[model samples]
Target: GSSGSSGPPKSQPVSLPEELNRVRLSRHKLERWCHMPFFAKTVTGCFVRIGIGNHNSKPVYRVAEITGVVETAKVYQLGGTRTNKGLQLRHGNDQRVFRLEFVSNQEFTESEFMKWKEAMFSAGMQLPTLDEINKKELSIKEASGPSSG
Candidate 1:
């Protein structure tokens, strides 16, 4: 005789908010949604904008290209060092790295960060996992040290 078998767990349908509904539609129709301020702070301490666009019949979420250094009045927690050297963000297809810096004293909470991640997911953005982020992280010594000639 065999013991009781465990079946697959039941999944409950969750009710999505209006913003999420809009995101779903935006993924299909490019004109269905207006431009919104969607920002994400990566584990590497880079604050990037998630812009929406369309190619053929597919909607895409890309990191907005930064032509020059963007200086804002909002405060952010920089990774590794506390200096105001600013954060460097590199595009997936571009070889250049952009800079972003903050100058205010206001701080954002963990809950807000979580909300941003959830919204990004709703918009079909693929966020990097902890392992991926760890692999991309550079130590302070390695980053600030001189390059081998």
Candidate 2:
């Protein structure tokens, strides 16, 4: 019997759908980053207008282009960080929160928007906030900037 079978079984590499191919972009020259299930790249119009919050009891919206995707689980981590002490466990059935990356306004047709909305809802994704989108975009740019230079 093999003696090295005590740990948790290796999970299968998650397979993403082809629809996500539209928005998925390479982090570097040849590196393909992992993205959430929702969000697809559109050919003509990739711009998305998302509601951020309520203003005078009315929803306020901001338009931006979907640039990338962020995941709840980090791709890498340092060993020095404690497994539990630093972890802030989200107390809920849903542990993962996927965020979409956005850049300032670019340009969508109604049909395209409708199609995108359907795809997001079908994948059980909720619309992200304007603040969160900006934060995510900043984080991505900061992470990639130094590495490439």
Candidate 3:
């Protein structure tokens, strides 16, 4: 094989919703909706974004997904240089890993994620699993005064 130049680096500043909606299958791009292998397990109905990041020495896109939020919001990024043909050809779980970090201010916004969730339900997409306990009111028997001390 002959050596070749790397792919372009991150340039366009894309929004979270825009990125997720633009899901495509490639060495750098993967969508949960697709029947692809690498991204098949990725959470559905969540937001996805691809941004400029470095891997190895080449400028490739980093994959991001809006999982949840805390005192600070976060996004999940996986892989690096798209220029790496081997990375693009990863047929199984033999590729790189993922990184979770606070999204830059110029990147995704937490408020947008909240709105996106609602839109997903409206679109007939399955809602994300809720582990929060459901609260309910219960009526219990009470005694009149104390039971004779």
Candidate 4:
């Protein structure tokens, strides 16, 4: 999906709406709407943004690509573990949502993300890259675990 900006991230000091919205939009556009709708959490937990259920009500597992994505607000339960230290690709079923709604990084203001998303939407379904998510994950890992290599 891409951080589908409902409007745009306002360029202001960091706040709750911006952080929560940041998480939501980040999950919405980049994570769930991913052609495969895949993502990872911090050293704590994470969930797939998109889960598909067809008109027939049967879930269609996207083949790592090619599918649309999952639901927007359905926060799949998952968390990060402190000892998740070496696996580069630890794909698992640990998913969930938490009250950790306070985001720390001011990656972009609410206004910016919104405006950019609006423009991108007008053009096409802008998908977030794996590299971007990896970068995000790395930051989360550092912030949460602060593991020393």
Candidate 5:
């Protein structure tokens, strides 16, 4: 049987799994996470990225969990600190706590994303009327005082 090849093997990018495609998608509001979809999830071999250590800026492949925020229709990681541990993490074992305050992106889909948008409006996260917004700014000014300048 042939074992070794002088030339490098051909490689091709693979499509992310259905669940993996969706990471941190939630409905309720969290602390740091914005009022939008987040891609935060436990890192796997499929996720290729170098994470930084806590003690120093030393780079390591031991990424535990990743938190990303949606900006301009894309997600961006919050920091480099991999979840609790790093590369040594036991997949989805110790870190299996699902914050009820938020939902899983895997639970959401493209159609759901759109459905959720309208759902949010029905949930009272919609934009206020111009008159209401003006009143809001006026209230803010009254509370914080006039801007200096």
Candidate 6:
């Protein structure tokens, strides 16, 4: 009986059953970052880069539980040191609370943030727009031309 295997034995990578299982899918939004489909990217008319920590967690986190809005309150730890100086955070078991700094590319005004929130909850998050945007059909008006009545 041949004791040793003839050629070089190929090593098969071992995998856990839970991690190996994957479902094939298509036609899903690719831009948002959250793992769950229920969680979506915060979008507004002007603000593209929005900061969200815990408030938007919904069933996991609620709004009424938070109150402190002081921007300069000194955060302390067990040793009485600085951790973060934003909001009073109860985000998660570790560190979830944080000050959200929304970046709008410095393009829009502060008022635009409200507009973004309205859009995010209403239409922007679920779909880019309610109306169909036909790129090929859309065109720019002729420059240096008469205005059409």
Q: Write the per-residue lDDT of candidate 5 for residues 1-149, one digit (tens) a residue.
A: 66865853333111212222222212221222232123132121112112222356542322122322222333333342112222222122223222212222233244433333343335444322344333433433333333436
Structure candidate 1, residue pairs in collision: none
Candidate 3: residue 126 lDDT (0-100): 34
lDDT of 1 at 56: 90
User: lDDT of model 6 at residue 15?
Assistant: 23
lDDT to native, each model: 0.31, 0.30, 0.29, 0.30, 0.28, 0.24
Kindly report which residue stretches of model 1 are placed more than 4 angstroms away from their true locations once superposed.
Answer: 1-108, 139-141, 145-149
lDDT per residue, candidate 6, 1-149, as tens digits?
A: 55765653333211221111111000121122112222111111101222343364441212111223234566444122333333332221222333333211222223433333344345433211211111101211111113436
- Local lDDT at 60 for model 4: 32
lDDT (C-alpha) at residue 2 in model 6: 55
lDDT of 4 by residue, 27-120 (tens): 3222222222132323222222223223675533110111222234433322331211111111122223222121122344344445444543
Better of 3 and 6 by TM-score: 3
- Ten-residue segment with the worst summed lDDT in candidate 5? 42-51
After superposition, the stretches of candidate 3 with alpha carbons farther than 4 Å from their true spots are: 1-47, 50-80, 83-108, 131-149
lDDT per residue for candidate 1 within 1-149, as digits (tens), equals 66877654333111222222211111111111111122122213323433333469854433322223334454444333222223234344333433232221122223333554565557664444333233323321233324525
TM-scores for the candidates: 0.29, 0.26, 0.23, 0.22, 0.19, 0.16
RMSD of 2: 18.4
lDDT of 4 at 13: 21
- As for model 4, its CA RMSD to the true structure in angstroms is 16.2
Against the true structure, candidate 5 has what lDDT? 0.28
Residue 84 miss distance in model 1 (angstroms): 13
- Candidate 6 deviant stretches above 4 angstroms: 1-59, 62-71, 78-81, 87-119, 123-149
Which residue pairs clash in candidate 3?
10-52, 20-48
Rate residue 122 of model 4 by lDDT: 60
**Positional deviation of 1 in candidate 2, in angstroms?**
34
